[PDB]
């Protein structure tokens, strides 16, 4: 067809933070479509990929991926907490990111 998307779009909002101290080890993700923790409970444990590009070709590609997963819900509005192998570079606040449907329970 014309669409081939097998993931859900999301936005990298910020790190986990207090009013004046942030914590880069936990990122905050807005998954689009979900507006409550009860709907966000479907997406727990799903893999997340941040997909970006670079000028230098490394192993056949100019596209590099950072992997992570959803761990828990955050707040009352469907924001989730996500942890990555290496933390997200904080210039990606507001950048798009992919939530895959695996590991599936359905």
């Amino acid at each position: 067809a014309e669409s081939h998307r097998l993931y859900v779009k999301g936005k990298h909002l910020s790190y986990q933070r207090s009013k004046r101290v942030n914590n880069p080890n936990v990122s905050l993700i807005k998954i689009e479509g979900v507006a409550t923790p009860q709907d966000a409970q479907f997406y727990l444990g799903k893999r997340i990929a941040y997909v970006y590009r670079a000028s230098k070709e490394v192993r056949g590609s100019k596209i590099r991926v950072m992997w992570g997963k959803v761990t828990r819900t955050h707040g009352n509005s469907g924001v989730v907490r996500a942890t990555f192998r290496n933390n997200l570079p904080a210039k990606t606040f507001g950048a798009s990111v992919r939530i895959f449907l695996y590991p599936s329970n359905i």
Partner: protein, 167 residues
Amino acid sequence: TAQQAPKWYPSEDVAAPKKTRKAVRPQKLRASLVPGTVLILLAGRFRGKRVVYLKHLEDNTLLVTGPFKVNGVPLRRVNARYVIATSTKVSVEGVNVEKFNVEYFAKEKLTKKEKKEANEIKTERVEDQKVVDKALLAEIKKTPLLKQYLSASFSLKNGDKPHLLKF
């Protein structure tokens, strides 16, 4: 001397590990996976394609087929955590899937010397595929539009919420 000595040397004998208590009970699959279910492949080379599930294998994998005449997916095994069990059900009674096992799919592992600088199929595999898919498509021809459904790919459109969608 440059360094004097250590007064005691540590022993070089490696100890044995303790006797473990982790036996292997078999995998308890989720309830939506019954044989004959149409699955959607979430990842892999054939991602977004709808296949039919036949047999639960020994290494917790699912035996699936396209059929190969419909969408070009051969006889294959997939992971149960990388599929979506749709509610669409066909009957796979009349297919002899006990031939396939974990030794049926062997990669014939490659040596470190054989490096592909720049750049085939088992005849047993191809007539096994031809035996099973002609038994599947006879069950496919009963209810309408299943051949078209299995040939078409799955993809998420704008406005599709997977937490609200029923498959």
